[PDB]
Amino acid sequence: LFDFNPSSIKFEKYPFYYWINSSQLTEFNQYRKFVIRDSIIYSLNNYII
Amino acid sequence: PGEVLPLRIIKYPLGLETIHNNIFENTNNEGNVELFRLRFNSNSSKMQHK
Amino acid sequence: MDTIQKMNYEATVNMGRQDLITREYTFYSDYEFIPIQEDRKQQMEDALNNLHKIIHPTVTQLKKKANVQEIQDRVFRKLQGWEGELNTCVFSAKNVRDSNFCADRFTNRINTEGVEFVKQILREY
Amino acid sequence: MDNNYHFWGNGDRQDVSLSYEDYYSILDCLLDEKLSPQGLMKFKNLHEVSMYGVSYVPLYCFPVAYGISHMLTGKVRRGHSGYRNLFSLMSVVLPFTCWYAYTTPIPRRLYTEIICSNNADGAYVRNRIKQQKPGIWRKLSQQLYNKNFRFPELNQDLTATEFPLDYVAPHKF
Amino acid sequence: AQTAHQNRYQGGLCYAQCNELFSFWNPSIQQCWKGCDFGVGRVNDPEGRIEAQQMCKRWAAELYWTYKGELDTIKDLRVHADMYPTTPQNVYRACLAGVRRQKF
Amino acid sequence: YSTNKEALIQNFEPLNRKFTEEEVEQFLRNEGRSQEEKRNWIYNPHIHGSTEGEWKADIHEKF
Ligand SMILES: CCCCCCCCCCCCCCCCCC(=O)OC[C@H](COP(=O)([O-])OCC(O)COP(=O)([O-])OC[C@@H](COC(=O)CCCCCCCCCCCCCCCCC)OC(=O)CCCCCCCCCCCCCCCCC)OC(=O)CCCCCCCCCCCCCCCCC
Ligand SMILES: CCCCCCCCCCCCCCCCCC(=O)OC[C@H](COP(=O)([O-])OCC(O)COP(=O)([O-])OC[C@@H](COC(=O)CCCCCCCCCCCCCCCCC)OC(=O)CCCCCCCCCCCCCCCCC)OC(=O)CCCCCCCCCCCCCCCCC
Ligand SMILES: Nc1ncnc2c1ncn2[C@@H]1O[C@H](COP(=O)(O)OP(=O)(O)OP(=O)(O)O)[C@@H](O)[C@H]1O
Numbered sequence A: 001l002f003d004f005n006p007s008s009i010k011f012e013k014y015p016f017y018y019w020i021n022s023s024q025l026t027e028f029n030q031y032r033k034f035v036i037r038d039s040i041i042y043s044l045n046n047y048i049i
Numbered sequence B: 001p002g003e004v005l006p007l008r009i010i011k012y013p014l015g016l017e018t019i020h021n022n023i024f025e026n027t028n029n030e031g032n033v034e035l036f037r038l039r040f041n042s043n044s045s046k047m048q049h050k
Numbered sequence C: 001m002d003t004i005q006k007m008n009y010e011a012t013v014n015m016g017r018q019d020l021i022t023r024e025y026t027f028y029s030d031y032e033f034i035p036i037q038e039d040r041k042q043q044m045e046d047a048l049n050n051l052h053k054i055i056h057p058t059v060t061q062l063k064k065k066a067n068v069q070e071i072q073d074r075v076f077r078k079l080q081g082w083e084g085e086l087n088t089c090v091f092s093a094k095n096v097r098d099s100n101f102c103a104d105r106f107t108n109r110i111n112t113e114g115v116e117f118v119k120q121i122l123r124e125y
Numbered sequence D: 001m002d003n004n005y006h007f008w009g010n011g012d013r014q015d016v017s018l019s020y021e022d023y024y025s026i027l028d029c030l031l032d033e034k035l036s037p038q039g040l041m042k043f044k045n046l047h048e049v050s051m052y053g054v055s056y057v058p059l060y061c062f063p064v065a066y067g068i069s070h071m072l073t074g075k076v077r078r079g080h081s082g083y084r085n086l087f088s089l090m091s092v093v094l095p096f097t098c099w100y101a102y103t104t105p106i107p108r109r110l111y112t113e114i115i116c117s118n119n120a121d122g123a124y125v126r127n128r129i130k131q132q133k134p135g136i137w138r139k140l141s142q143q144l145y146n147k148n149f150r151f152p153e154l155n156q157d158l159t160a161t162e163f164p165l166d167y168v169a170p171h172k173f
Numbered sequence E: 001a002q003t004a005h006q007n008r009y010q011g012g013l014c015y016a017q018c019n020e021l022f023s024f025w026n027p028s029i030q031q032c033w034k035g036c037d038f039g040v041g042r043v044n045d046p047e048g049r050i051e052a053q054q055m056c057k058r059w060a061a062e063l064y065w066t067y068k069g070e071l072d073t074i075k076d077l078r079v080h081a082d083m084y085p086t087t088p089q090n091v092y093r094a095c096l097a098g099v100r101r102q103k104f
Numbered sequence F: 001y002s003t004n005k006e007a008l009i010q011n012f013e014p015l016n017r018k019f020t021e022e023e024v025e026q027f028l029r030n031e032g033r034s035q036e037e038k039r040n041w042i043y044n045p046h047i048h049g050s051t052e053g054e055w056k057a058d059i060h061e062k063f
Helices: A032-048 C003-016 C018-022 C038-061 C065-092 C096-124 D020-028 D037-073 D079-103 D109-116 D120-132 D134-146 E013-021 E028-039 E046-063 E088-101 F002-011 F021-029 F052-062
Strands: B007-011 B036-040
Touching: A032 C065, B007 C065, B036 C038, B036 C065, C038 C065, C038 C096, C065 C096, D020 D037, D020 D079, D020 D120, D020 D134, D037 D079, D037 D109, D037 D120, D109 D120, D109 D134, D120 D134, E013 E028, E013 E088, E028 E046, E028 E088, E046 E088
Parallel strands: none
Antiparallel strands: B007 B036
16 A cells, blocks of 8 residues: 555456466466367457458 | 376385285396386277276 | 286286277267377487486486486476476377477477576586 | 564564465465475465464454445334344355455464565565466555565566566556 | 393393384394394304304295395395385394394 | 783685685585484485495595
């Protein structure tokens, strides 16, 4: 209530924006069977674009 | 569910067998003990035997 | 062969032929990836054999299983870090060319970084 | 400045502050196989502290909720006569105070050690929070940048060759 | 149960030394007591000590299935607190520790 | 007091060098050394190089 408070602003419009598929930035220490999740995220991004 | 991934790196358990006081049980053809193994998956669209 | 020998041989061959009969059964709703090629499989096996050759002296000399387990766990973490990337790229790979590229990257990363890390940790131990 | 600054469960004014809800959410997206024994020990100590802290939070919030319930009932203190209404209305006021307290982040030496560690465990936890918990990682990265921590996972990284994966809140350059 | 005294207090300083050496829940204390009993009247003799060690070998062999050469090829004969008599090697090491602890 | 002062003033000479790379590396390697129990040095050709005897001699000289 007196010091720096991080903002809560976020993207509210772009679909599936926060479904972050694994890459170099996020490393590859995720759950092993998230390869299908990454593939589905890639397909959804392709469909959007 | 989720399919078997193309590659898995598996640690060889150590100390399971105390016979003759040998911690390592797997030895490579070149004559060196093995601590890790690579298991590969082919034909992911296939059942696993019971 | 005798009856018992024939029965034992039949048992061995049937136990080995599980894949032959499980191949025919396949599932439709399946996420199917391109399997890694045999050449790349052999290259990765050779890289792991080189790592084991590097590691053998220290582990053999060590007499307490705890240190061996610690070394194994550290090297396993290092290798699994790259294994995750290899699996992610191979599963998304859309051709044997992409699969071979991913396998080559994985094996080169082993041969350089894993070799350096294994030498460093073995010297530290 | 107490006489137990060594204590791991203790904290400082400028140490990394994490909420109990954020800590419990972070616990969900972590794997013990991928952490070193030192990191596992750090997490176990953090759980040891949190076990008592979470249970004590409602104890801390009780007086505020009691006062709020009394004010809502009115300006009459009737002792045992008003217990029914006091504790029936306080049964919803106290949850609100606990909600505020839990949403409030608190500094902790263990929190800063686990998040800001410059080793494999620190990198792993930061990347897992960044990927599987983008909402928490956004606030955590804002806090770290404000407190002068530089890591490649931070969205406020000005020396990165790759675009950030999350909205970058306004801040002073 | 298989020791020489109806209770551990009747046993001399060797039983107390075994209890100190091993944790209270570690059942290798019984093997250490067996080593003490084997070493009674033999530790103070150069040949008696070797005879007690052979007795420990025989005791371990009769307690657990073992092969010829395991006890000779044991790497470390030292014992820690969390060592349990789950193997002939552990039994033999505990018996040797008891023999060493035995004074008279 | 007189003897201590005289000895200190006589034998005090600041190190007028820069610690060499070998000295720094040895200081870093001396993290785990202890005189309570001697370390069991193990020769791995793939990380030490040279010959086993030469490596053992160098290790004995260093530590
Ligand atoms: C022999 C001679 C020797 C030689 C020397 C000479 C010695 C001579 C004699 C010396 C005598 C010295 C003492 C002088 C007299 C003192 C009198 C006195 O204190 O009473 C006056 C005091 C008020 O004075 P008053 O003038 O009579 O009345 C004022 C008005 O009536 C107006 O009052 P009111 O009606 O508006 O309100 C009364 C009360 C009516 O309401 C209640 O009674 C509340 C009932 C529900 C409580 C919550 C659920 C149950 C408890 C859960 C506890 C969980 C946490 C436990 C944590 C333990 C570890 C820290 O509401 C409150 O004010 C609530 C306060 C108590 C909250 C509960 C405290 C829990 C423990 C502490 C936790 C930390 C504090 C913050 C969190 C608090 C909430 C948990 O009377 C009371 O009402 C007594 C209340 C007692 C509450 C006890 C609760 C115990 C809970 C169980 C135990 C929990 C674990 C404990 C640790 C482990 C071991 C068990
Ligand atoms: C960490 C612990 C705490 C965690 C709490 C977490 C939150 C849980 C909330 C759950 C419920 C939702 C909220 C409801 C709000 C209701 C507000 C309201 O109007 O109620 C106040 C209302 C006020 O009454 P009143 O008409 O104004 O008269 C009071 C006077 O002014 C005289 O005033 P006084 O000051 O002298 O005494 C009054 C005192 C009277 O209350 C107390 O002293 C209890 C305080 C602690 C409450 C603990 C909640 C449950 C926690 C989980 C279970 C742990 C074990 C609990 C063991 C102790 C019993 C609660 O009232 C309070 O403490 C005020 C706060 C009460 C909050 C609500 C309590 C819900 C109780 C639910 C279970 C009832 C059956 C239990 C049977 C026994 C099972 C072993 O009192 C109640 O409704 C409470 C009744 C408690 C009955 C306890 C019976 C004990 C067993 C005796 C018989 C044993 C037979 C054994 C047979 C077998 C032998 C072999
Ligand atoms: N594979 C095993 N087979 C049988 N008993 C075992 C095995 N692993 C452990 N134990 C039992 O657990 C005890 C503790 O095991 P621990 O992991 O400490 O063994 P260690 O590191 O190989 O060395 P040590 O023989 O000194 O205990 C061993 O003394 C033995 O009693």
